[PDB]
Coordinates of N, CA and C and ligand atoms in Angstrom, one line a residue:
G29 N 13.9 -11.9 -16.0 CA 14.0 -13.1 -17.2 C 12.6 -14.3 -16.5
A30 N 13.2 -15.8 -16.4 CA 12.7 -16.9 -15.8 C 12.3 -17.0 -14.6
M31 N 13.0 -16.5 -13.8 CA 12.9 -17.1 -12.9 C 12.4 -15.7 -12.0
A32 N 12.1 -14.6 -12.7 CA 11.4 -13.5 -12.1 C 9.8 -14.5 -12.5
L33 N 10.0 -14.7 -13.1 CA 8.2 -15.4 -14.2 C 7.7 -16.0 -13.5
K34 N 8.9 -17.0 -13.2 CA 8.4 -18.2 -11.8 C 7.7 -17.9 -11.3
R35 N 8.5 -17.1 -10.3 CA 8.1 -16.4 -8.5 C 6.6 -15.5 -8.8
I36 N 6.6 -14.6 -9.9 CA 5.2 -14.1 -10.4 C 4.5 -14.9 -10.4
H37 N 4.2 -16.3 -11.5 CA 3.4 -17.1 -11.0 C 3.0 -17.0 -9.8
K38 N 3.4 -17.2 -8.9 CA 3.4 -18.5 -8.1 C 3.3 -17.6 -6.6
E39 N 3.4 -15.6 -6.4 CA 2.2 -14.8 -6.0 C 1.3 -15.1 -6.7
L40 N 0.9 -15.1 -7.6 CA -0.4 -14.5 -7.9 C -1.1 -15.9 -8.3
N41 N -0.9 -17.0 -8.0 CA -1.5 -17.8 -7.7 C -1.8 -18.6 -5.9
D42 N -0.6 -18.5 -5.5 CA -0.2 -17.9 -4.1 C -2.0 -17.2 -3.7
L43 N -2.2 -15.9 -3.7 CA -3.1 -15.1 -3.3 C -4.5 -15.2 -4.0
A44 N -4.4 -16.0 -5.2 CA -5.8 -16.9 -5.3 C -6.6 -17.8 -4.8
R45 N -5.5 -18.6 -3.7 CA -5.6 -20.4 -3.1 C -5.9 -19.7 -1.6
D46 N -5.2 -18.5 -1.7 CA -5.2 -17.9 0.1 C -5.9 -16.4 -0.2
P47 N -7.2 -15.7 -0.5 CA -7.5 -14.7 -1.0 C -7.5 -13.8 0.0
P48 N -6.5 -13.1 0.4 CA -6.9 -11.9 1.7 C -8.3 -11.9 1.8
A49 N -8.1 -11.2 3.5 CA -8.3 -10.4 3.8 C -8.6 -8.8 3.0
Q50 N -9.6 -8.5 2.3 CA -9.8 -7.8 2.1 C -8.9 -6.6 1.1
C51 N -8.0 -7.3 0.9 CA -6.9 -6.9 -0.5 C -7.2 -8.4 -1.9
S52 N -6.2 -7.5 -2.9 CA -6.5 -8.0 -3.6 C -5.4 -7.8 -5.0
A53 N -4.9 -8.7 -5.8 CA -3.7 -8.4 -6.4 C -3.8 -8.8 -7.5
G54 N -3.3 -8.7 -9.3 CA -2.8 -9.3 -10.0 C -2.4 -8.5 -11.3
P55 N -2.1 -9.4 -12.2 CA -1.5 -8.0 -13.6 C -2.8 -7.1 -14.6
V56 N -2.0 -6.5 -14.8 CA -3.3 -5.6 -14.9 C -4.1 -6.2 -16.7
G57 N -3.7 -6.8 -17.5 CA -4.0 -6.9 -19.2 C -3.0 -8.4 -18.9
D58 N -2.3 -8.8 -19.9 CA -1.8 -9.9 -19.7 C -0.6 -9.7 -20.1
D59 N 0.1 -8.0 -18.8 CA 1.2 -7.9 -18.7 C 1.8 -8.6 -17.4
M60 N 2.7 -9.9 -17.5 CA 2.8 -9.9 -15.7 C 3.8 -9.6 -15.2
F61 N 4.5 -8.7 -15.5 CA 5.4 -7.2 -14.6 C 4.6 -6.1 -14.3
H62 N 3.4 -6.4 -14.6 CA 2.7 -4.7 -14.0 C 1.3 -5.7 -13.5
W63 N 1.4 -4.4 -12.5 CA -0.2 -5.1 -11.4 C -1.0 -4.2 -11.3
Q64 N -2.0 -4.3 -10.3 CA -3.0 -3.1 -9.8 C -2.9 -4.0 -8.7
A65 N -3.4 -3.3 -8.2 CA -4.3 -4.1 -6.2 C -5.2 -3.1 -6.5
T66 N -6.0 -3.7 -4.9 CA -6.9 -3.1 -4.1 C -7.0 -3.2 -3.1
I67 N -6.9 -2.8 -2.5 CA -7.3 -2.8 -0.4 C -8.4 -1.8 0.1
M68 N -9.1 -2.6 0.9 CA -10.0 -2.0 1.5 C -10.1 -1.3 2.7
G69 N -10.7 0.0 2.7 CA -10.4 0.4 4.5 C -10.1 -0.1 5.3
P70 N -9.8 -0.3 6.8 CA -9.4 -1.0 7.4 C -11.0 -0.8 8.0
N71 N -12.0 -1.6 8.7 CA -12.9 -1.5 9.7 C -12.1 -0.9 11.1
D72 N -12.9 0.3 11.5 CA -12.2 0.9 13.0 C -11.4 1.7 12.7
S73 N -10.7 1.9 10.9 CA -9.3 3.0 10.7 C -10.9 4.7 9.9
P74 N -10.4 5.4 10.2 CA -11.0 6.3 9.2 C -10.9 5.6 8.3
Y75 N -10.8 5.3 6.9 CA -10.4 4.4 5.8 C -11.5 3.7 5.8
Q76 N -12.3 3.7 6.8 CA -13.4 2.2 6.3 C -14.2 2.8 5.4
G77 N -14.4 1.5 4.5 CA -16.1 1.7 3.6 C -15.0 2.2 2.2
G78 N -13.6 2.9 2.3 CA -13.2 3.1 0.9 C -12.6 2.2 0.7
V79 N -12.5 2.5 -0.4 CA -11.3 1.8 -1.6 C -10.0 2.0 -1.8
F80 N -9.3 1.2 -2.1 CA -8.2 2.4 -2.6 C -7.1 1.1 -3.4
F81 N -6.1 2.0 -4.8 CA -6.2 1.0 -5.3 C -4.8 1.1 -5.6
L82 N -3.7 0.7 -6.2 CA -2.1 0.8 -7.0 C -2.0 -0.1 -7.4
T83 N -0.9 0.8 -8.1 CA -0.4 -0.2 -9.1 C 1.0 -0.5 -8.7
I84 N 1.7 -2.4 -9.3 CA 2.8 -2.5 -8.6 C 3.4 -3.1 -10.1
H85 N 5.2 -2.5 -10.6 CA 5.7 -3.0 -11.6 C 6.5 -3.6 -10.8
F86 N 7.0 -5.1 -11.3 CA 7.9 -6.0 -10.3 C 9.3 -5.6 -11.9
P87 N 10.5 -5.7 -11.1 CA 11.7 -5.4 -12.0 C 11.9 -7.0 -12.3
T88 N 12.7 -7.0 -13.6 CA 13.3 -8.4 -13.7 C 14.3 -8.8 -13.3
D89 N 14.7 -9.2 -11.8 CA 15.2 -9.6 -11.0 C 14.6 -9.6 -10.3
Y90 N 13.7 -9.6 -10.1 CA 12.2 -10.1 -8.9 C 12.6 -11.5 -8.0
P91 N 12.8 -12.1 -7.4 CA 12.3 -11.3 -6.5 C 13.6 -10.7 -5.2
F92 N 15.0 -10.9 -5.9 CA 15.4 -9.7 -5.4 C 15.7 -8.2 -5.1
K93 N 15.3 -7.7 -6.2 CA 15.0 -6.6 -5.6 C 13.5 -6.4 -5.5
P94 N 13.1 -5.1 -4.7 CA 11.8 -4.8 -4.6 C 10.5 -4.5 -5.6
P95 N 9.6 -4.6 -5.7 CA 8.6 -4.3 -6.8 C 8.5 -2.8 -6.3
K96 N 7.8 -2.0 -7.5 CA 7.5 -0.4 -7.1 C 5.9 -0.1 -7.0
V97 N 5.2 0.1 -6.0 CA 3.9 0.3 -5.7 C 4.3 2.1 -5.1
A98 N 3.3 1.5 -5.8 CA 2.6 3.7 -5.6 C 0.7 3.3 -5.5
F99 N -0.2 4.3 -4.4 CA -1.3 4.1 -4.7 C -1.2 4.6 -5.7
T100 N -2.5 4.6 -6.6 CA -3.4 5.7 -7.7 C -4.9 6.9 -6.8
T101 N -5.1 6.2 -5.9 CA -6.4 6.7 -5.4 C -5.0 7.9 -4.3
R102 N -6.0 8.9 -4.0 CA -5.7 10.2 -3.3 C -6.3 9.4 -1.5
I103 N -5.6 9.5 -1.0 CA -5.5 9.2 0.8 C -4.9 10.5 1.7
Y104 N -5.5 10.5 3.3 CA -4.6 11.6 3.6 C -4.4 10.7 5.1
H105 N -2.9 10.7 4.6 CA -1.8 9.7 5.2 C -0.2 9.9 6.0
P106 N 0.0 9.9 6.9 CA 1.4 10.8 6.7 C 2.8 10.1 6.1
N107 N 2.4 9.1 5.4 CA 3.9 8.3 5.0 C 3.1 7.3 3.4
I108 N 2.1 8.9 3.2 CA 1.7 8.3 1.0 C 1.6 10.0 0.7
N109 N 1.7 10.2 0.2 CA 2.0 11.9 -0.2 C 1.2 11.6 -2.2
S110 N 1.1 13.0 -2.5 CA 0.1 13.1 -3.5 C 0.6 12.5 -4.8
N111 N 1.5 11.8 -5.0 CA 2.1 11.1 -6.0 C 1.9 9.7 -5.4
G112 N 1.1 9.3 -4.2 CA 0.7 8.0 -4.3 C 1.9 7.1 -3.8
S113 N 3.0 8.0 -3.4 CA 4.5 7.4 -2.8 C 4.1 7.1 -2.1
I114 N 5.0 6.0 -1.7 CA 4.7 4.9 -0.1 C 5.7 4.7 1.1
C115 N 5.8 5.6 2.0 CA 7.3 5.6 2.7 C 7.1 4.6 3.7
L116 N 7.8 3.2 3.0 CA 7.7 1.4 4.0 C 8.7 1.0 3.8
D117 N 9.6 0.7 4.8 CA 11.2 0.2 4.8 C 11.0 -0.9 4.1
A118 N 10.1 -2.1 3.7 CA 10.3 -2.8 3.3 C 10.5 -2.8 1.7
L119 N 9.9 -1.7 1.3 CA 10.2 -1.4 -0.3 C 11.2 -0.8 -0.6
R120 N 12.5 -0.5 -0.3 CA 13.6 0.2 0.6 C 14.3 -0.7 0.8
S121 N 15.1 -0.5 1.6 CA 16.6 -0.5 2.6 C 16.1 -1.8 2.8
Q122 N 14.7 -2.5 2.7 CA 14.5 -3.8 4.1 C 14.0 -4.4 3.3
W123 N 13.7 -4.7 2.2 CA 13.7 -5.6 1.1 C 14.7 -7.1 1.4
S124 N 13.8 -8.3 1.1 CA 14.4 -9.3 1.4 C 13.5 -10.5 -0.5
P125 N 13.8 -11.4 0.0 CA 13.1 -12.5 -1.6 C 12.0 -13.0 -0.4
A126 N 12.0 -12.9 1.2 CA 10.9 -13.8 1.7 C 10.0 -12.7 1.9
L127 N 10.4 -11.4 1.5 CA 8.7 -10.5 1.1 C 8.7 -11.1 -0.5
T128 N 6.6 -10.7 -0.3 CA 6.0 -11.2 -1.6 C 4.7 -9.7 -1.4
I129 N 4.4 -10.3 -3.1 CA 3.1 -9.0 -2.5 C 2.2 -9.2 -1.9
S130 N 1.7 -10.3 -1.6 CA 0.6 -10.5 -0.5 C 1.2 -10.2 1.2
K131 N 2.0 -10.4 1.1 CA 2.8 -10.1 2.5 C 3.1 -8.4 2.3
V132 N 3.3 -7.6 1.0 CA 3.5 -6.0 1.4 C 2.5 -5.5 1.8
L133 N 1.1 -6.3 0.7 CA -0.3 -5.7 0.5 C -0.8 -5.4 2.0
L134 N -0.5 -6.7 2.9 CA -0.8 -6.6 4.5 C 0.0 -5.7 5.4
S135 N 1.0 -5.2 4.6 CA 1.8 -4.3 5.6 C 1.9 -2.7 4.9
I136 N 1.0 -2.7 4.2 CA 0.6 -1.5 3.8 C -0.9 -1.2 4.7
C137 N -1.2 -2.4 4.8 CA -2.5 -2.2 5.4 C -2.5 -1.8 7.0
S138 N -1.8 -2.4 7.5 CA -1.3 -2.1 8.4 C -1.2 -0.7 9.0
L139 N 0.2 -0.2 7.6 CA 0.4 1.1 7.7 C -0.5 2.0 8.0
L140 N -1.5 1.8 6.9 CA -2.8 2.5 7.3 C -3.2 2.9 8.2
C141 N -3.4 1.7 9.1 CA -4.3 1.1 10.4 C -2.4 2.7 11.6
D142 N -1.5 2.1 11.2 CA -1.1 3.1 12.1 C 0.1 3.4 11.3
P143 N 0.3 4.5 11.6 CA 1.6 5.8 10.4 C 2.9 5.4 11.1
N144 N 3.9 5.5 10.6 CA 4.8 5.1 11.0 C 5.8 7.0 11.5
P145 N 6.7 6.6 12.6 CA 6.1 8.6 13.2 C 7.6 8.7 11.9
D146 N 8.4 8.3 12.1 CA 10.0 8.1 11.4 C 9.8 9.4 10.2
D147 N 8.9 8.8 9.7 CA 8.9 8.9 8.1 C 7.2 10.1 7.8
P148 N 7.9 11.3 7.8 CA 6.9 12.3 7.4 C 7.1 12.4 6.2
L149 N 6.1 11.7 5.3 CA 6.8 11.9 3.9 C 4.9 13.3 3.0
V150 N 4.5 13.4 4.3 CA 3.4 14.6 4.1 C 3.9 15.2 5.6
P151 N 4.9 16.5 6.3 CA 4.4 16.5 7.4 C 4.2 17.3 8.1
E152 N 2.7 17.9 7.0 CA 1.6 18.5 8.0 C 0.7 17.7 8.5
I153 N 0.3 16.5 7.4 CA -0.3 15.3 8.0 C 0.2 14.2 8.6
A154 N 2.0 14.4 9.6 CA 2.0 13.9 10.3 C 2.0 15.0 11.6
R155 N 2.5 16.0 10.9 CA 1.6 16.7 12.4 C 0.6 16.5 12.7
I156 N -0.5 16.8 12.1 CA -2.2 16.0 12.6 C -2.6 14.9 13.2
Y157 N -1.3 13.8 12.8 CA -1.7 12.3 13.7 C -1.0 12.9 14.8
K158 N -0.1 13.6 15.4 CA 1.0 13.3 16.1 C 0.2 14.4 17.5
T159 N -0.7 15.5 17.4 CA -0.8 16.4 17.9 C -2.4 16.8 18.0
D160 N -3.4 15.8 17.0 CA -4.6 15.6 17.2 C -5.2 15.2 16.4
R161 N -5.3 14.3 17.1 CA -6.1 12.5 16.3 C -7.2 12.5 15.7
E162 N -8.5 13.4 16.9 CA -9.7 13.5 16.4 C -9.1 14.5 15.0
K163 N -9.0 15.4 15.2 CA -9.2 16.0 13.8 C -7.9 15.8 12.6
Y164 N -7.3 14.5 12.7 CA -7.2 13.6 11.4 C -7.2 13.4 11.1
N165 N -8.5 11.8 12.7 CA -9.3 10.8 11.9 C -10.6 11.7 11.1
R166 N -10.8 13.0 11.4 CA -12.1 13.3 11.0 C -11.9 14.1 9.3
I167 N -9.9 14.2 9.2 CA -10.0 14.7 7.6 C -9.8 13.0 6.4
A168 N -9.3 12.6 7.5 CA -9.3 11.6 6.9 C -10.2 10.4 6.3
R169 N -11.8 10.4 7.2 CA -12.5 10.2 7.1 C -12.9 11.1 6.0
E170 N -12.8 12.4 5.9 CA -13.2 13.2 4.9 C -13.4 12.7 3.1
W171 N -11.9 12.7 3.1 CA -11.0 12.5 2.4 C -11.3 11.1 1.3
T172 N -11.5 10.1 2.5 CA -12.3 8.8 1.8 C -13.7 8.8 0.8
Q173 N -14.4 9.4 1.6 CA -15.4 9.5 1.2 C -15.6 10.9 -0.6
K174 N -14.1 11.6 -0.2 CA -14.3 12.5 -1.6 C -13.5 11.4 -2.7
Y175 N -12.8 10.7 -2.2 CA -12.4 10.0 -3.2 C -12.3 8.3 -3.3
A176 N -12.1 8.3 -2.7 CA -12.3 6.9 -2.5 C -13.7 5.7 -2.0
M177 N -14.4 6.9 -2.2 CA -15.4 5.5 -2.4 C -16.5 6.1 -3.8
Ligands
CL212 CL1 10.4 -19.2 -6.9

């Protein structure tokens, strides 16, 4: 309804006025409720140099339910699966209307930097992250080269 549209426009404007570091987001075309986003691989992470795309769909009662957010770029990470689904509590049980796309993008950036142990969406990647970090990094770098450049 009009409440969601007002908030979504305000958030688009918030991102333009204070352009993050290393992320962007906004409507695909003219559909305010369907956005794209991009996140640059953080420096000093195995994703450095990559560019990762995401899709975002706002519900019609945003901001009082969460947006649906998924990666569209393949990534080697314990909490993001091959469907691009993202295990992040803010997008589920922990949503609040005080969260915004900017905060969500910052949280996903931090998640790339430091995975969540409790949430292995891809159990084998979570295992290599815990047991052999240098191997995890090497493979995450290789997938950044293959998919995100
Ligand atoms: Cl508002």
